[PDB]
Scaffold this active site. Structure first.
Site: not given
Ligand SMILES: Nc1ncnc2c1ncn2[C@H]1C[C@H](O)[C@]2(COP(=O)(O)OP(=O)(O)OP(=O)(O)O)C[C@H]12
Ligand SMILES: [Ca+2]
Ligand SMILES: [Ca+2]
Ligand SMILES: [Ca+2]
Length: 376
Positions: A46, A102
């Site tokens: 990242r 979450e």
């Molecule tokens: N638009 C999307 N399409 C498919 N999968 C998605 C998505 N947005 C998020 N995800 C997944 C991947 C990711 O690991 C996830 C949560 O992502 P998110 O809360 O945005 O942040 P993370 O990448 O997990 O980690 P961080 O908040 O620490 O940057 C379970 C969903």
């Molecule tokens: Ca988040």
DNA sequence: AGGACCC
DNA sequence: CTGGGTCCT
């Protein structure tokens, strides 16, 4: 009265589950790949410029030494998701999931119960766990202050448990409603927690730069707002209700305005077992009736191994995208609700297919999905 | 059956 | 966008 809500949010989720499987990835930039996407990545990649939801070609020409894992099978992540809710569910039973990573937990009863255990002397030994938002001073005599600190101690104990028993790290925000707990959870990433005192609430709300940063306002509601001269949280805070009630229907108006001041009445609700479970897949092209039948078979085979345990579903949903979407549903016959079942099912789904897609005319689909709703 | 939101 | 999910009209 005043609640104590915590919002738990795991660090680089998919990336994280990958590293717990093959730790040789830990000391090296890691991205989780889905078709031509990099949906998430560990923090090592990242810093090297890789970002969430970035094209694999951009991600190779911004980090050409990046290691890719395929995570199109959500099976391992989903199992971890629920391991996390259940660990949280143990502190307090009322846990709301929001996606796979979450969780909200209403810590109010727990906080109350803890104070009443304390003796009017050790009510000053009390400290905070983790950050305090805006670096705000704590007034140990402010009962709400004392409550939010306790709430932060619990939050830390959740986070500790999660690591000890699941090997996972994430962030927490403690605040007094879900909107605020979620906005403050992200202030220190990764693997920190931040608690929000009331005096610092306006600070947080006015710290946001685009209204689309408000959980509740999404793509459309934004563009309708921008096309109205509302660009800041204050532009919307101070805008006129009527004009807005009118434009967006009294429902969403009064709620995003109330959001815009950091007011969130909404309770934390037991998510429980899912209300649906599906399987998606997307592509470049599918233009035959025989290709559609086999894709719809694989989707249904994974679904079946899933559809075991607990309850059973009483409806079938079929989703297509052609080049937004379209869908056709119907119920699952009763003797069919008895766990070979694949053969009648495929006939049904295809009948639902033909209803939607015309075989004698040309068709180009870029997504298929098989959903089971209505579990009993 | 779709629309809007969420990750 | 991807591979899922929630609720409401
Ligand atoms: N638009 C999307 N399409 C498919 N999968 C998605 C998505 N947005 C998020 N995800 C997944 C991947 C990711 O690991 C996830 C949560 O992502 P998110 O809360 O945005 O942040 P993370 O990448 O997990 O980690 P961080 O908040 O620490 O940057 C379970 C969903
Ligand atoms: Ca988040
Ligand atoms: Ca996360
Ligand atoms: Ca948002």
């Amino acid at each position: 009265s005043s609640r104590v809500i915590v919002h738990v949010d795991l660090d680089c989720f998919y990336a994280q589950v990958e590293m717990i499987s093959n730790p040789e990835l830990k000391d090296k930039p890691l991205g989780v790949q889905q078709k031509y996407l990099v949906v998430t990545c560990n923090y090592e990649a990242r810093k090297l410029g890789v970002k969430k939801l970035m094209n694999v070609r951009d991600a190779k020409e911004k980090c050409p030494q990046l290691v890719l894992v395929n995570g199109e099978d959500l099976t391992r992540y989903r199992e971890m998701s629920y391991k996390v809710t259940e660990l949280l569910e143990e502190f307090s039973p009322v846990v709301e999931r929001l996606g796979f990573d979450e969780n909200f937990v209403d810590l109010t009863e727990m906080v109350e119960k803890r104070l009443q255990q304390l003796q009017s002397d050790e009510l000053s030994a009390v400290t905070v766990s983790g950050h305090v938002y805006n670096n705000q001073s704590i007034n140990l005599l402010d009962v709400l202050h004392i409550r939010l600190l306790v709430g932060s101690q619990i939050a830390a104990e959740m986070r500790e448990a999660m690591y000890n028993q699941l090997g996972l790290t994430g962030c927490a925000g403690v605040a007094s409603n879900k909107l605020l707990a979620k906005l403050v959870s992200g202030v220190f990433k990764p693997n920190q927690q931040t608690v929000l005192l009331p005096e610092s609430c306006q600070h947080l709300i006015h710290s946001l730069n685009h209204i689309k940063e408000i959980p509740g306002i999404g793509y459309k509601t934004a563009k309708c707002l921008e096309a109205l001269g509302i660009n800041s949280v204050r532009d919307l805070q101070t805008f006129s209700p009527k004009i807005l009630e009118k434009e967006l229907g009294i429902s969403v108006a009064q709620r995003i305005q109330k959001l815009s001041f950091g007011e969130d009445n909404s309770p934390v609700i037991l998510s429980g077992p899912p209300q649906s479970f599906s399987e998606e897949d997307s592509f470049k092209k599918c233009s035959s009736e025989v290709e559609a039948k086999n894709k719809i078979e694989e989707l249904l085979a994974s679904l079946l191994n899933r559809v075991c345990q607990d309850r059973k579903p009483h409806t079938v949903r079929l989703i297509i995208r052609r080049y937004g979407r379209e869908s056709r549903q119907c119920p699952i016959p009763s003797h069919v609700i008895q766990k070979d079942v694949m053969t009648p099912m495929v006939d049904i789904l295809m009948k639902l297919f033909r209803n939607m897609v015309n075989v004698k005319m040309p068709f180009h689909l870029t997504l298929l999905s098989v959903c089971f709703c209505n579990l009993k």
